[PDB]
Every structure is written in structure tokens, then in C-alpha cells.
């Protein structure tokens, strides 16, 4: 029993983290085979943050300008190229600890583990969801850029996120490992801000099922609703629409608890309309939306 | 910015996890140098859970009865001995991935990372606090026994917890790595239950400081209280007494925010008396007590 925000074991990723320094900027890189991936803004100076032309900044670089350190061992850079908002530094040594890996881009509503790193050294691991507004609510200080987000399936590390920036509300933005930003963010100095966010309805229902599996039942009722009547209430409380695909995905959790998805929807409608009246669910006085149905199945089996 | 429940990077511990099987019981072991540590209840059968005499059960064992598997490699057991509620299985191979380590016993109110494992395979990592009642609120299914809790200081793994059991409320109990239970729990079949728990006051104050560092200020006020008047309120709400040592430990966070500890105590008193009136702190509608002052300093620098 019990239900915790649980990260993947980070060892396979720890073995890929390196330090990349350009001038006075140090951040983290990801060392896979003979390539180090890092945020291209490592090549920026204080004196060109407004409208940096990264193609010009990179043309003016030499391999020797990039100092790459894997623990106490310097890696020789033998090639540099830009890939959207990521730099690919070819090095003369293949990482012997390279795991089986993929570069996958995730959807809003999906979760992943973050290995927060400073100076190429892992400091901590935690779960994040990709918000509907394509930000993540992480924990990142200066130096954290190049820290990566990932999922592990069997022996395979699916890298989905590389950290680039903090937005004014204290939320985080970055790219996939092909260097493409999540959401309408740029690696240049602007007044850019998180857009309006919404609650991930399917995840809230998954977490209510986790609560039931773990013996919290107080919010259950005899009522069912229609998907249409549910979505009328969801829209009102800034929840995402629930689709038939969401209902289908919640199938196994529905089967395991014997609670129909639209029955659990009637519980959620009551919680949105009335609040918890001083009760808690899985140690929370808020409705939690950063667990996917998969997260619940994985942990509650 | 941001403040997350963050686990230590788990790689150093992943490299120590093995599978230990006796008869039809499989659980996890910790492989350090040429010793595998695991819960002694691996030697129990269904037919002796009431009052097992573990000294008798162990005398009847042979090294060959213990099947120890490190990935796809069987370890030959060459010695077995009991250490309180843990078994020490001497094996013919020193773990080449043994990190620098210590066996430390923690206090109630301290935190640690759990690497939840099944069949000697890590599944996930999360933070736990040792509750005042010596239980932990973890996430553990059958097969999780022998999963360990730890802290990492520089390169050194301080092992503090090994998982043994789930109590009727869904909370968890286990031992230090010398096999001594945390709290008044036994590895035998009884109606044993968690005793009354309390809130870890110093941790709640540490988390209020984390909130301030991260720009949540709404709960601040111009009021200060005495330590005595604060403790009168704490006692009333089932909070632990706050000591001068707690005030001293909160010194750095007090210095960093410019908010005196007894000033932050006046905020906590108001939150206990009035609630949050529909507001949140660091994404919580509850007062959080599983972050230590050290956890806040480590993460917020």
C-alpha cells in the first residue's frame, strides 16, 4: 500500500551527465555514445541576450572553446553543430555507460523524472508533469540547464526534456532532445510568460482510483453522470475536457476497483462543487493531477 | 526557483540491489563488499508466522538454501548469520560497485530516499520522513522487503532503513541496517499498530521558509510570539514542541529570508488557528512536515 510521487531510478542517467563550459558559462550536458548534448545558450554572452544570432555565435566557436568534463576526466571536443536549440559536441570518446536510449517528445499531461544536476553532478531526482501550457513545475537553480527529463521502459531510457529556462512565475521551460522547445518559448531575452494553464482531468481521475486502491473511499457516491454533463462541469472549473479515449485508458483502473469511470466522474463533480469539507485524499487537501493512469497502474502493481 | 520533494540520485544504491529467495519467499538484499543484508523473515514459512524462533529457523538452514541473484548472475552463499532482524549472507564475490558507505540510524523527523525494489530490480525512488511514531508513509507492495532508505553526503551512502512490513493503517516499518527496528514493531504476526503520531514542527517552519524563498509570502505577518506561547498552541494542535535547538537549526533560513524564527512561529500559529482560507503554500493546501531544514537549504542552494 501507499501512493507516492515516485521517480525512475536515476543510475542510467547519472552515468551520462557531464559539465560543459564556454567562457564563464557552465551548464550540464548529456553524453551518449560520442556526442554531448547541451543547451545552445551556453555559447551566449551577457552582451548578446536580446537577439543572439546563434548561427553567427556558433560559426565563431572552435572545438577547443568547449570544455567538457566527465567527472575528473576532460573530454576532447572534435566537432560542434547546432540542432535547433541544442548543441551537439562530438567527442573523441564514446560514453562506456551509454544506456539503451530513445529521444521521445512527450504530450502535455504526461509525466517524467528529472535528474537535477549542477556542474555535471547529479543532486536530486523528482517527478514532473508536462503542463497543458507546456511548462513544468520543477526545482532548478542557476547552473541546472542541461538537466534532463526521462522515462525508463524495461532497460531503455526515453529522454524527453532538457532544461533551458525559468519563466517569471517560477515555472520551467525547455526542449526535447532534438532541441525543439515545449511551448511558445525562446532561448532569448523577452517578457515571455507561461500562458493560462488547466487541470489534467484524466490524471485527477487516475489519482482518485489510486486513492480507492489505497482505501480512501469517502468521496465515492452512488451517482453516475454522462460524459457531456461531466464536461460542462469540468469546463466551468478550468479542467480539460474528458474524451472517450481517456475513459478507455482508465478502463483497467475501473476494472480493478469495480468503479465505472462515469461513476468516478460523479465523485469528481461533487469534489469540484463542494470541496473536500476538511478531508484529505492520499495526504492531499487538493485534487492532484500529476499522476497519469500509467503511473497509478505501475505503482499500484 | 521551485521546491519539490526530491530524492537522492539512486545509482550508487541500484548497484547494490540483489534478489534473495528462501523456499517460496523472494525479497531484496543489499550487496556491500562480500555480504548480502536482507530481512531475516525470508527464512519464515506460512506455517510459523505466530511465534517464529528465528535462531531455530536459521540453525536449520544451509548456505545452499539461500538463492542470491545479482542481475542474471547467481552469487554463491558461503556463510549465513543473524544480526538482530537482518540476515548477513557472506558471498564468495565482493560487489565491485560497492560505494563508500556507512550504516547510520536516523531520528524521527529526519528524511531519506527509498529505492523501492522488487525481485532485486529497482522500480522507483522517493523521499520519506521517519514519523515521530517511527513509521514511514511509503509505497511498498508485496516483494518490496529489503528495499533500503539512505542519504548521500558527497560520495558516501549513509544507509538508514531496510523495509520489513506494512502496518494495518497502510504505513510502513523496518529496521536500521544493523537489524534494529524503528519503533515498537516485531517481525512476527501480532495485532501491532502505529502509535499516535504528531506533526514535526521544525520541518513545517523549514517548509514555510522554503515557501518564502520561493515567493509565497501571504501567510507572513508583523507579529512575533514567545517560544513558550508558541508551544502552548503547538501542543493544542498535536505539533511537537519547538526547542531552542530547533530555533538555532533554523538560523541560516532565518538569516537568508530576514524573518526571525519566532516571527515565522507567529505565522504558523495563525495558520493553525485560522487555516489557509482557500490559499496554498508551495502547491499544498496542508502544512507540510516532511522537509528538514537541511532539505530546504540543500535544495534552495
From Swiss-Prot, chains A, B:
Organism: Severe acute respiratory syndrome coronavirus 2
Notes on how activity is controlled: Inhibited by pyridone-containing alpha-ketoamides compounds 13a and 13b. In turn, alpha-ketoamide 13b (tert-butyl (1-((S)-1-(((S)-4-(benzylamino)-3,4-dioxo-1-((S)-2-oxopyrrolidin-3-yl)butan-2-yl)amino)-3-cyclopropyl-1-oxopropan-2-yl)-2-oxo-1,2-dihydropyridin-3-yl)carbamate) inhibits SARS-CoV-2 replication in human lung cells. Inhibited ex vivo by michael acceptor inhibitor N3. Inhibited ex vivo by compound 11a and 11b.
Effect of residue 90 to R: In strain: Beta/B.1.351
Ranges of the Cytoplasmic topological domain: 1-301
Domain Peptidase C30 span(s) in chain numbering: 1-301
Active site positions: 41 (for 3cl-pro activity), 145 (nucleophile)
Catalytic activity: TSAVLQ-|-SGFRK-NH2 and SGVTFQ-|-GKFKK the two peptides corresponding to the two self-cleavage sites of the SARS 3C-like proteinase are the two most reactive peptide substrates. The enzyme exhibits a strong preference for substrates containing Gln at P1 position and Leu at P2 position
Outcome when changing residue 145 to A: Complete loss of 3C-like proteinase nsp5 cleavage
Protein name, as recorded: 3C-like proteinase nsp5
Localization (cell): Host cytoplasm; Host Golgi apparatus; Host nucleus
Function per UniProt: Cleaves the C-terminus of replicase polyprotein at 11 sites. Recognizes substrates containing the core sequence [ILMVF]-Q-|-[SGACN]. Cleaves and inactivates human TRMT1, preventing tRNA guanine(26)-dimethylation of tRNAs. May cleave human NLRP1 in lung epithelial cells, thereby activating the NLRP1 inflammasome pathway. May cleave human GSDMD, triggering alternative GSDME-mediated epithelial cell death upon activation of the NLRP1 inflammasome, which may enhance the release interleukins 1B, 6, 16 and 18. Also able to bind an ADP-ribose-1''-phosphate (ADRP).
Full-protein residues shown: 3264 to 3564 of 7096
Per UniProt, location of the Glycyl lysine isopeptide (Lys-Gly) (interchain with G-Cter in ubiquitin) cross-link in this chain: 5, 90
Subunit relationships: 3CL-PRO exists as monomer and homodimer. Only the homodimer shows catalytic activity. Interacts with host FBXO22; this interaction promotes the proteasomal degradation of nsp5.
Amino acid at each position: 500500500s501507499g501512493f507516492r510521487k515516485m521517480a525512475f531510478p536515476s543510475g542510467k542517467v547519472e552515468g551520462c551527465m557531464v559539465q560543459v563550459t564556454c567562457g564563464t558559462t557552465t551548464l550540464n550536458g548529456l553524453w551518449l555514445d560520442d556526442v554531448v548534448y547541451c543547451p545552445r545558450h551556453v555559447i551566449c554572452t551577457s552582451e548578446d541576450m536580446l537577439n543572439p544570432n546563434y548561427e553567427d555565435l556558433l560559426i565563431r566557436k572552435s572545438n577547443h572553446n568547449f570544455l567538457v568534463q566527465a567527472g575528473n576526466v576532460q573530454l576532447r571536443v572534435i566537432g560542434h553543430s547546432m540542432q535547433n536549440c541544442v548543441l551537439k559536441l562530438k567527442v573523441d570518446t564514446a560514453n562506456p555507460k551509454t544506456p539503451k536510449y530513445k529521444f521521445v517528445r512527450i504530450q502535455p499531461g504526461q509525466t517524467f523524472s528529472v535528474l537535477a544536476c549542477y556542474n555535471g553532478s547529479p543532486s536530486g531526482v523528482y517527478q514532473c508533469a508536462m503542463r497543458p501550457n507546456f511548462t513544468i513545475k520543477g526545482s532548478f537553480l542557476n547552473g541546472s540547464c542541461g538537466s534532463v527529463g526521462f522515462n525508463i521502459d524495461y532497460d531503455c531510457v526515453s529522454f524527453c526534456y532538457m532544461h533551458h529556462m525559468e519563466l517569471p512565475t517560477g515555472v520551467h521551460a525547455g526542449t526535447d532532445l532534438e532541441g525543439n522547445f515545449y511551448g511558445p518559448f525562446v532561448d532569448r531575452q523577452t517578457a515571455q510568460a507561461a500562458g493560462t494553464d488547466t487541470t489534467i482531468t484524466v490524471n485527477v481521475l487516475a489519482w482518485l482510483y489510486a486513492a480507492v486502491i489505497n482505501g480512501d473511499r469517502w468521496f465515492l457516491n452512488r451517482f453516475t453522470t454522462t460524459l457531456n454533463d461531466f464536461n460542462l462541469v469540468a469546463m466551468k472549473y478550468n479542467y480539460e475536457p474528458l474524451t472517450q479515449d481517456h475513459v478507455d485508458i482508465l478502463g483497467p483502473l475501473s476494472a480493478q476497483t469495480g468503479i465505472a469511470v462515469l461513476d468516478m466522474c460523479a465523485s469528481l463533480k461533487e469534489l469540484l462543487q463542494n470541496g473536500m469539507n476538511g478531508r484529505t485524499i492520499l495526504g492531499s487537501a487538493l485534487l492532484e493531477d500529476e499522476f497519469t493512469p500509467f503511473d497509478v497502474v505501475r505503482q499500484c502493481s
